[PDB]
Amino acid sequence: VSTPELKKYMDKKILLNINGSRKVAGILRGYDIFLNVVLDDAMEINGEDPANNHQLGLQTVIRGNSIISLEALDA
Template sequence: MSKTHPPELKKYMDKQVNIKLNGNRNVSGVLRGFDPFMNIVVEDCIEHMKTGESQSIGMVVIRGNSIVIMVIFFNLFFFNFYLNLGAYGTNSMTLKRIFDLLKRKGKNNLKIIFLGF
């Protein structure tokens, strides 16, 4: 049996994250903790509905097997831009469009990490 390794999320602690969950749910907040099973703790969590509405849900524990993709943002401008485009259904073509738009606005120093599971 292969040995499992804990997720390497320590360097992303206290960073703003956007998490797409199965069931087409999307939440964002600050990463505060994780365990070897990829269960994570998110503080100041906000659920983003497809209607464009947002609802604050406080501190939550998200089970690792429900995470589809987690995006860590290092640039608050990009995070706000991402949410304003309704990124809960984001695919790579949409992300390419976002990067192109930001480059035209002179935002070339963006750092973003996508963690797919």
């Protein structure tokens, strides 16, 4: 019905936690009414910051059902 308001964030590097354990931080391009969020230059954060981190793809889309919280690291 109503679109979530992410409007200020877009174009800002954002960390968000998906479903049970996973945390993913990436630039955010698009959002829809289900909160499905597509962000580019995705990286999967882990305990060891440089080491266990692995990039995902050039463009990644996320189902809104697996989003627990969204925090934007930036202005």
